[PDB]
Design a protein around this nucleic acid. Structure first.
Lengths: 37, 119, 122, 134
RNA sequence: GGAAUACUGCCAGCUGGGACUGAGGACUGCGACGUAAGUCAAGGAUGCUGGCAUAAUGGUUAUAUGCCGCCCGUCUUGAAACACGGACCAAGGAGUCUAACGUCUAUGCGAGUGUUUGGGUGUAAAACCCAUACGCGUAAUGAAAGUGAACGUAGGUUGGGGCCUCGCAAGAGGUGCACAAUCGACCGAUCCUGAUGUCUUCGGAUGGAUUUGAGUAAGAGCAUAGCUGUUGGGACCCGAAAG
RNA sequence: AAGCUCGUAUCAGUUUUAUGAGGUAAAGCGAAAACUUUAAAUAUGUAAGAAGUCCUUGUUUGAACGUGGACAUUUGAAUGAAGAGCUUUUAGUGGGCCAUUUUUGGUAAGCAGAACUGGCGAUGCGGGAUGAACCGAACGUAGAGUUAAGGUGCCGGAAUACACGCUCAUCAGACACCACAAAAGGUGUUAG
RNA sequence: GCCCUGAAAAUGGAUGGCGCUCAAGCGUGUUACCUAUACUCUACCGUCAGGGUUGAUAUGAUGCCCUGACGAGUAGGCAGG
RNA sequence: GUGGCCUAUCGAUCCUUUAGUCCCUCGGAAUUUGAGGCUAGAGGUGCCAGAAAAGUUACCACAGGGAUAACUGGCUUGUG
């Protein structure tokens, strides 16, 4: 979806990267949670 | 190269993920990397409204009324050049009439026969 | 209008009408249009009161405007009601009919035999 | 396209029977308007107040005309000086009738109007506010 | 070298045989032949002749002959049929009444409207008359205390049926109802600004910024009747296993 | 329909002109078969003006909103017709077969999923001996004429018509047809 | 190009049937003929639309007169009886 | 010197907390504790709770709907 030219309905790929990094950081946060407990 | 709200633009892909591929729309939005287009699509018998997001190299400008403006200019020109005289202007476009009678001459041209020999 | 004919070829028969077939059609199956209503001509008063604003004032002036395609042709044509023809009196020939006139049929452009067709459908 | 009065009022039937003839032989556009207005239902024929009639006569140059209402002419108590008009209409409430006659004008009906102004000269047509209801 | 016939086409050329049709009901029109008066195949049939006057034409009916016609109703869109009901007859048999809201139409009155819970009366469950009250309406808005609709000719522009003026007529000009769009003015709520006076904290003068309401900006509702829609009542009818 | 609220010189499953994209290549030929310029229509897109155009020239010398003023009909291709939208408001119905045209994926074979055009359901009438999907076909009551598709030995209305060829089958052939058996065998016959 | 083999069972049997071999079979061409509720013209019924008309003693004013185009139908909708 | 590093979902409108210039209300009237509103803020699935509170019955009763099995597509036979 980065290079895919037209998207068929905010720029819609930036939201996609935003959610990507959202889940990535949730994972990397829960990593610390498990390390501490 | 400044696409704004209201402009009218074509689509061109310099794989086949979506095929609008040369349907002309109107811009409603612009960003540093993408553009927004609207499209009228026939769903049954009516033109319903679709929205689209396209990159910059995958778009261009249109040349639709390019002849319209030149022709209304020249219409205005000959209109006054007609008022400035006595005239039968007739400033409308007509379709291709049927061609009229002529005579062809056979002096360097004696008709060179051929048959389906084939050759 | 050439491409209209090229579209609807498989359903029609057309060609180039002579003067005498136009004359016969207009004289025998010619009905005008007084604002509506498909009125029969039978007279020059009906033509004159309805097309005298274009210089046509007789059934012969109407035939002239038709055959020698004129600048009041659109109006002189849309004055007349589409002609109601009957089946041909000798038949069409052609055991089968929906094939191109070139291929032994009826539809398409016969280009001069439209007179021999219309004079029997008249 | 409404053509026939749906009521049974015999006098309204007569009024239509006169106006169809007038509008068929007169070609003055006023008559066709009045005829079309005589077919309207009671919810499309709202009333018009003496105060709206007065405000209508208060425009410039229109102080000597006859005003015509196809509905009713109600009254209003919020005005104190009423002009010396002449109103033709269908109905008159007692209040409006007394107010106009005390002002000094006349009250008449559509058929007396048909006799007076046949083509419809020097007339005004007013319609009450329709969509104000729900 | 001079012709002819064939073939395709045109004639506002001529002349025979056959079949179906005769709508219309004083006159008016467009025409043709006429020296003319007049005649005519020109805006839809008349002239002459014969037979019989009744079961002859025609109708109803029984049968024969030629061709045609798969058994009804219901339930599933395809083998679209299958499947379920039908022995025959007569009588009975299924979208009704009511209560509450709503659209539309008719009538009565109209900024109002509704006599009939009651009283008076009578030719006695009829008809006729009536006082005081009450509902709905004539005003909203705030969570609430509360507050509560004119800068002007009740507004500026954009069109707007009609009307007046000029015009031979098209047209031009003036005025503009209802209604629609936009910028305004007013009322309530929210945020600020915070006087003249105050009992030292009361009170809210004058002016602004958005957002919001079926708000105001010369009222339109009330009442009964009819067709109807939604909901409840056994609710179009019959058919069941329960507590 | 209830519905009156506006009818405009406006609409349209159509063509044409301008401009796009598909580019296969048939173009031909490119400076050496790579070139990068080119021909028609092939189905989809957009446009073709009277609330449209012209003149002074403010806003912070280009562009955008201006002020104020001016141009009405050969008015800007063809063809056909005066008929949609707004709100009030409402009855029945809401997921399937057949065939055709393109694309995607397929296998012993059939096929599976798409979008599009007809038909059927609600539908009679002529023909295919019989028939939802095949071929004709604009359903009031009648008279005359002419025909579509299909046919003209008899059943059965209509030429045991005319003309040129091919075929002999020990259950020929007279069709859903250009499909499976289908690629081959034959001292059967014809023409290349 | 025609023709013969190129497999496929079971009550009796189907180019629709009789029958047909210089065809009544296969390819093709020129004509004449038969026939639908389709096309053309005419008369009658109805629907829709466009025109004219209360003027008297002549009448049915939701009337009367002139003209033109149309008519399939389930659920459902309207109008007249 | 390489043939890996990590992971529950879920709301976030079922609610956590707090303060008011002279903010408004609490039914006969006051005062003080108290409650309730709307105006502010400050917090966000860490800490809870769950997409419904378990089976079995062959006497099993009532109202409905069901076949037709050998024929989609000319399929079937002797040699992978």
């Amino acid at each position: 979806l980065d290079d895919q030219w037209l998207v068929e309905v905010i720029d819609p790929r930036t939201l996609n990267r935003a959610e990507r990094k959202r889940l990535v950081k949730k994972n990397e946060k829960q990593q610390r949670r498990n390390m501490k407990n | 190269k400044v696409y704004k709200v209201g402009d009218i633009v074509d689509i061109k892909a310099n794989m086949p993920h979506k095929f609008y591929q040369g349907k002309t729309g109107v811009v409603y939005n612009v960003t540093k990397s993408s553009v927004g287009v609207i499209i009228n699509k026939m769903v049954g018998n009516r033109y319903l409204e679709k929205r689209l997001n396209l990159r910059v190299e995958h778009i261009k400008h249109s040349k639709c009324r390019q002849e319209f403006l030149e022709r209304v200019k020249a219409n205005a020109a000959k209109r006054a050049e007609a008022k400035a005289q006595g005239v039968a202007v007739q400033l409308k476009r007509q379709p291709a009439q049927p061609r009229e009678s002529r005579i062809v001459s056979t002096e360097g041209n004696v008709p060179q026969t051929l048959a389906p020999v084939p050759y | 209008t050439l491409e209209l004919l090229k579209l609807i070829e498989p359903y029609v028969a057309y060609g180039y009408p002579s003067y005498s077939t136009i004359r016969q059609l207009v004289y025998k199956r010619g009905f005008g249009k007084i604002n509506k209503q498909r009125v029969p001509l039978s007279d020059n008063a009906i033509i004159e009161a309805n097309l005298g604003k274009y210089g046509i004032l007789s059934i012969d002036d109407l035939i002239h405007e038709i055959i020698t395609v004129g600048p009041h042709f659109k109006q002189a044509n849309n004055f007349l009601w589409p002609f109601k023809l009957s089946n041909p009196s000798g038949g069409w020939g052609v055991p089968r009919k929906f094939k191109h006139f070139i291929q032994g049929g009826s539809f398409g452009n016969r280009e001069e035999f439209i007179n021999k067709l219309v004079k029997s459908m008249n | 396209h409404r053509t026939a009065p749906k009521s049974d009022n015999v006098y309204l039937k007569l009024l239509v029977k006169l106006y169809t003839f007038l509008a068929r032989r007169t070609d003055a556009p006023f008559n066709k308007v009045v005829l079309k207005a005589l077919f309207l239902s009671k919810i499309n024929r709202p009333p018009v107040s003496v105060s709206r009639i007065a405000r209508a006569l208060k425009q410039e140059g229109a102080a000597n005309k006859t005003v015509v209402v196809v509905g009713t002419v109600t009254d209003d108590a919020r005005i104190f000086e009423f002009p010396k008009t002449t109103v033709a209409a269908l109905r008159f409430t007692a209040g409006a009738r007394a107010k106009i006659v005390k002002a000094g004008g006349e009250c008449i009906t559509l058929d007396q109007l048909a006799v007076r102004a046949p083509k419809g000269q020097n007339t005004l047509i007013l319609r009450g506010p329709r969509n104000s209801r729900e």
